[PDB]
mmCIF file with all atom_site columns, C-alpha atoms in Angstrom:
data_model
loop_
_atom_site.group_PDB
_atom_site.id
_atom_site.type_symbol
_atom_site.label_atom_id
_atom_site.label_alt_id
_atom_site.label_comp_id
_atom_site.label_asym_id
_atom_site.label_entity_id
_atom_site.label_seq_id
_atom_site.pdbx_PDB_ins_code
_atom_site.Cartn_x
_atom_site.Cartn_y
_atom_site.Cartn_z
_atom_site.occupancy
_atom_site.B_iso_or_equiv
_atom_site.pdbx_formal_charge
_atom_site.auth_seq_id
_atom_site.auth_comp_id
_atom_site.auth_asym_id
_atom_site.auth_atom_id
_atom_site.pdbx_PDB_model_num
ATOM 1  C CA . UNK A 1 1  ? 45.696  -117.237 242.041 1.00 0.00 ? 1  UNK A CA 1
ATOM 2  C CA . UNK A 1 2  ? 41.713  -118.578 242.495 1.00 0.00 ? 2  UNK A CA 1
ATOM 3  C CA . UNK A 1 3  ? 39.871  -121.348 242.773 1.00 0.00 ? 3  UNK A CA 1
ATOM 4  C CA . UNK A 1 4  ? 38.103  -122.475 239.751 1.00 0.00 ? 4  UNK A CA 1
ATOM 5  C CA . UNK A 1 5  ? 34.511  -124.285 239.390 1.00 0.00 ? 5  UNK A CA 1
ATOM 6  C CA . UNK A 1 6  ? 34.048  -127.576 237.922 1.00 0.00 ? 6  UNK A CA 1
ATOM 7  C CA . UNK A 1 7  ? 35.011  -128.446 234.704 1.00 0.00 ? 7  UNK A CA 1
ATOM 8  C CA . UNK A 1 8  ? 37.650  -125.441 233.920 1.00 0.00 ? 8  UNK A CA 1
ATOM 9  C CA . UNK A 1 9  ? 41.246  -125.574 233.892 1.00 0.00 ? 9  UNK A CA 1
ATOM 10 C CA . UNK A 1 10 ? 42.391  -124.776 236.810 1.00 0.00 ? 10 UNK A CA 1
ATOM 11 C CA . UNK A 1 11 ? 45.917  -122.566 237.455 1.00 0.00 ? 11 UNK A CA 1
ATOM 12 C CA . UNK A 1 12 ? 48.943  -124.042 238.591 1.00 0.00 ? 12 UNK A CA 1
ATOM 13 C CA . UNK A 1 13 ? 50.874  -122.480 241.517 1.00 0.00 ? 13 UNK A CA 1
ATOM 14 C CA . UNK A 1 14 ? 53.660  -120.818 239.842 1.00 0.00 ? 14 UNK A CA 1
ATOM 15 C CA . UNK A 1 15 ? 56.573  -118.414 240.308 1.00 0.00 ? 15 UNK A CA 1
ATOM 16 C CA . UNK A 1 16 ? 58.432  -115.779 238.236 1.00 0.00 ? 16 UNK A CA 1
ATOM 17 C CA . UNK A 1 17 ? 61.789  -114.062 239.213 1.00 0.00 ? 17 UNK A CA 1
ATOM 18 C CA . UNK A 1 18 ? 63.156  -111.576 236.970 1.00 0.00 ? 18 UNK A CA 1
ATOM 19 C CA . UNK A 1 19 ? 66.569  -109.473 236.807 1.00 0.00 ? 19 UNK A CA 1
ATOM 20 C CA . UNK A 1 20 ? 67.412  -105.763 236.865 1.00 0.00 ? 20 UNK A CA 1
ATOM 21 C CA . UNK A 1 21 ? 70.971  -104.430 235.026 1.00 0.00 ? 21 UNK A CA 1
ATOM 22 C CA . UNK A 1 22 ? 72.790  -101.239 236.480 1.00 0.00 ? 22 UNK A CA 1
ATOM 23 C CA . UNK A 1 23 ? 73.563  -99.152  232.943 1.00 0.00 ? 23 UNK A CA 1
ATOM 24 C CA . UNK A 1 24 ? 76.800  -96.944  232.925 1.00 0.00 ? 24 UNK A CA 1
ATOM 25 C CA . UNK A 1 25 ? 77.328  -93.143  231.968 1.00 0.00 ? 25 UNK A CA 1
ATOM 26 C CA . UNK A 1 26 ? 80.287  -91.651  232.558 1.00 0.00 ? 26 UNK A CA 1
ATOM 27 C CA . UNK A 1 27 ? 80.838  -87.817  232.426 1.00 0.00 ? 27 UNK A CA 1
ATOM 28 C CA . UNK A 1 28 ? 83.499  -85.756  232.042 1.00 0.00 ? 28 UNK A CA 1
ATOM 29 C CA . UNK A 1 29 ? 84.933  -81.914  231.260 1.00 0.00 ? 29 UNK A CA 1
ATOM 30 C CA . UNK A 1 30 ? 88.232  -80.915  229.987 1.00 0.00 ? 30 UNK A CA 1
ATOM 31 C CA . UNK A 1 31 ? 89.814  -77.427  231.251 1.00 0.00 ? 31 UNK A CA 1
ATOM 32 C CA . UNK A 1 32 ? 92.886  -75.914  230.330 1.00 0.00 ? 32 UNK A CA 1
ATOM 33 C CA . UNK A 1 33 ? 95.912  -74.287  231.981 1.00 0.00 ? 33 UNK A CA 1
ATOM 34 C CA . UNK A 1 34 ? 98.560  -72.473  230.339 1.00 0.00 ? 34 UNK A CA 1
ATOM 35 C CA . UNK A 1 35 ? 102.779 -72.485  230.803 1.00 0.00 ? 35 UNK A CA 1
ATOM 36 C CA . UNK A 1 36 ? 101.726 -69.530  232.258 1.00 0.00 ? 36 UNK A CA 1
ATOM 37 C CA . UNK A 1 37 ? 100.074 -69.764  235.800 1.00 0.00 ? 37 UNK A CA 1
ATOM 38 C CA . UNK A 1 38 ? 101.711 -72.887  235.638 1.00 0.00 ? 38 UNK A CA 1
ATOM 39 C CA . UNK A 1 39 ? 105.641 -71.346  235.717 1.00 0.00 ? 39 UNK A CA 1
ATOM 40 C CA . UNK A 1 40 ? 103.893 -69.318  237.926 1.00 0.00 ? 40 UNK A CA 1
ATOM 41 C CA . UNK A 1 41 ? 102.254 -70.906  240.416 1.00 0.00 ? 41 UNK A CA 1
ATOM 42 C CA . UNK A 1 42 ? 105.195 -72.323  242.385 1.00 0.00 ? 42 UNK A CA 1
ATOM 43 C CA . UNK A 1 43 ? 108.031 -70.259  241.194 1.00 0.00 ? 43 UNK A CA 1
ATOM 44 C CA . UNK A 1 44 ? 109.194 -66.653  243.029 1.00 0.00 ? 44 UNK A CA 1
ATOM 45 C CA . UNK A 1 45 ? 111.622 -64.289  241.541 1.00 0.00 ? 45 UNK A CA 1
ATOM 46 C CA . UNK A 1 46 ? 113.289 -61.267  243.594 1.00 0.00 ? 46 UNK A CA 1
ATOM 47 C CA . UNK A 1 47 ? 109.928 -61.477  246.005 1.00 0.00 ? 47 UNK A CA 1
ATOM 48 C CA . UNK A 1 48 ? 109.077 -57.802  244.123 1.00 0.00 ? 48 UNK A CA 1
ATOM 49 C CA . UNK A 1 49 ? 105.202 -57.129  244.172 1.00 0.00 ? 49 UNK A CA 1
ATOM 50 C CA . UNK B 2 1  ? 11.103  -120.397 225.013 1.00 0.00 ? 1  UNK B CA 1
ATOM 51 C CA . UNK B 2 2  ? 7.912   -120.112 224.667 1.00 0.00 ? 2  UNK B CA 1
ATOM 52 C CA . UNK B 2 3  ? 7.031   -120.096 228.360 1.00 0.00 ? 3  UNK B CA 1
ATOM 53 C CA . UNK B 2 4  ? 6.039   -117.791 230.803 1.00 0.00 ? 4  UNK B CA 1
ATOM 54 C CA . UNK B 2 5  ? 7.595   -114.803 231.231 1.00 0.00 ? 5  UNK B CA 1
ATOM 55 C CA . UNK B 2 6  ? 9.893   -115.359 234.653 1.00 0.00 ? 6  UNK B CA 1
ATOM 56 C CA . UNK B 2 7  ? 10.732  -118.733 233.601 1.00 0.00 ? 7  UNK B CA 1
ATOM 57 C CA . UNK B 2 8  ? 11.782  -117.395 229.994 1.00 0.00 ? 8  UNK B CA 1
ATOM 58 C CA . UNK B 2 9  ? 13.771  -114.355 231.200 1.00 0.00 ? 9  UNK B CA 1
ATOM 59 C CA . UNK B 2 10 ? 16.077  -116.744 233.863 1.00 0.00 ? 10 UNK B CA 1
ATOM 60 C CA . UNK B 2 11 ? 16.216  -119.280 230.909 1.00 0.00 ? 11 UNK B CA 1
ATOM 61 C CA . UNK B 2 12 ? 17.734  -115.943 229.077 1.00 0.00 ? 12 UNK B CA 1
ATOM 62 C CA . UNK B 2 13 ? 20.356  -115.284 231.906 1.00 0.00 ? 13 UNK B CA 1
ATOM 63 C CA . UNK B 2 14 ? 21.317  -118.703 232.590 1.00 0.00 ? 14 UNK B CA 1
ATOM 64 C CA . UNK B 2 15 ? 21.791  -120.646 228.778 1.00 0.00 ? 15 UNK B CA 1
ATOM 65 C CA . UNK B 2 16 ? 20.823  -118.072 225.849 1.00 0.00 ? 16 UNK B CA 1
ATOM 66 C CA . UNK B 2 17 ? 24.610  -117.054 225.386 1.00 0.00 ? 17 UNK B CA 1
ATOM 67 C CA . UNK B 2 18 ? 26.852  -117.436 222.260 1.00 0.00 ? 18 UNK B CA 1
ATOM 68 C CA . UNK B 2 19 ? 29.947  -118.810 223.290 1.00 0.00 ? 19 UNK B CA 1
ATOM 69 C CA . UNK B 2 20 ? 32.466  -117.169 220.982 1.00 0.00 ? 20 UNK B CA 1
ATOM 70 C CA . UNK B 2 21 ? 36.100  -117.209 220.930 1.00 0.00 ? 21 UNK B CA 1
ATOM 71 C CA . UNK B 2 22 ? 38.724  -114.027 221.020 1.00 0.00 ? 22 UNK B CA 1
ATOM 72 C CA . UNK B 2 23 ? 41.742  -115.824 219.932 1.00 0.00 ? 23 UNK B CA 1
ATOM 73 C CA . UNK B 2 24 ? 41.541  -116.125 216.292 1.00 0.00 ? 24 UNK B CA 1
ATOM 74 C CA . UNK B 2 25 ? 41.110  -113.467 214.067 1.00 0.00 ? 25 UNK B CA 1
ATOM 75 C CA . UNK B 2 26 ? 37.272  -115.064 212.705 1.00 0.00 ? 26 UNK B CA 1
ATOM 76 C CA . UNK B 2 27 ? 34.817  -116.043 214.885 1.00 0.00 ? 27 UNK B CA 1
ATOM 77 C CA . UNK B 2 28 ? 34.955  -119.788 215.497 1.00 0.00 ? 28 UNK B CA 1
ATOM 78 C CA . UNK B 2 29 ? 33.055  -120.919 218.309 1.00 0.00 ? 29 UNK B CA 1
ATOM 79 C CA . UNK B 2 30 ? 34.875  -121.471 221.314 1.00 0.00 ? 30 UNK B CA 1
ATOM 80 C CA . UNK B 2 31 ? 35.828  -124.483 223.248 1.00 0.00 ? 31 UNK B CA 1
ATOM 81 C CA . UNK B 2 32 ? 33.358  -125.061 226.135 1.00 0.00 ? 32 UNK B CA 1
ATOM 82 C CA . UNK B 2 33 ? 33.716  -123.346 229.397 1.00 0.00 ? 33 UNK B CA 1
ATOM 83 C CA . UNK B 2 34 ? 37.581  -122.550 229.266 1.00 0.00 ? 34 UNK B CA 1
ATOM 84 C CA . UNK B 2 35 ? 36.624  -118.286 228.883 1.00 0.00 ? 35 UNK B CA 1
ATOM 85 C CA . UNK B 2 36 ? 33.467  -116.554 229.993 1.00 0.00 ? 36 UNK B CA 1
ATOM 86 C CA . UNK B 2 37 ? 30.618  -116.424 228.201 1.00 0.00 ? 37 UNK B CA 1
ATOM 87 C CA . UNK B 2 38 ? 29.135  -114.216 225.457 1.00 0.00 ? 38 UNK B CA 1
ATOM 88 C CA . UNK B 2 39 ? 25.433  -112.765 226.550 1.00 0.00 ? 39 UNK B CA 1
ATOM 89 C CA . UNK B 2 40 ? 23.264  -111.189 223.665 1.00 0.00 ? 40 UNK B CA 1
ATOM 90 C CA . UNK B 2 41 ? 20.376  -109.348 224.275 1.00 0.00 ? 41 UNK B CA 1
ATOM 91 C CA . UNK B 2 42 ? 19.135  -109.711 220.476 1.00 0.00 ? 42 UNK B CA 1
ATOM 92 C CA . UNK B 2 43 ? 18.696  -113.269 221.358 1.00 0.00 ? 43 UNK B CA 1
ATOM 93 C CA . UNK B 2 44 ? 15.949  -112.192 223.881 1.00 0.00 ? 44 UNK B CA 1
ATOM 94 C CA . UNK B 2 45 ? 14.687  -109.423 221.523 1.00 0.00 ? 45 UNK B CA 1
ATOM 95 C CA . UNK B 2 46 ? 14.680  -111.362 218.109 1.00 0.00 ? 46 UNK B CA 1
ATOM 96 C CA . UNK B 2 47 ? 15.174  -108.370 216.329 1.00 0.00 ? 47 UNK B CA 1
ATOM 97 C CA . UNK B 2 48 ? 18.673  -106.907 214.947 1.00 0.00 ? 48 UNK B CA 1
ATOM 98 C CA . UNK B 2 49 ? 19.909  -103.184 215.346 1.00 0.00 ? 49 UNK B CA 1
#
């Protein structure tokens, strides 16, 4: 603040606190896997090549 | 104002001032000394534009 002169209304010594709010935004992707690579990712049969 | 011209030219920067208010949408005249001052040079000139 300042000083004022004479005759003026003068300020007041004053404070101001003031919040701030975290804002969400969540992402995502879907992907796909067939019965196929999945009976086959795990699974062996007569080790041929 | 009639006086000489150093004494009328400080009485020009010291009191010949209007005094007008920004807060209402007409021009009232504004209450004393609370906002700065309104200097015209038209009041020193006489004359209009």
């Amino acid at each position: 603040r300042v000083a004022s002169g004479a005759g003026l209304p003068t300020s007041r010594q004053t404070t101001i606190m003031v919040t701030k709010y975290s804002e969400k935004s969540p992402i995502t992707i879907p992907f796909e896997l067939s019965a196929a690579c999945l009976t086959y990712l795990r699974e062996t049969f007569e080790g041929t090549i | 104002a009639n006086k000489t011209l150093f004494k009328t030219i400080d009485e020009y920067l010291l009191r010949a001032k209007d005094c007008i208010r920004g807060d209402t949408d007409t021009q009232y005249v504004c209450v004393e000394g609370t906002e700065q001052l309104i200097e015209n040079p038209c009041r020193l000139t006489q004359e209009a534009l």
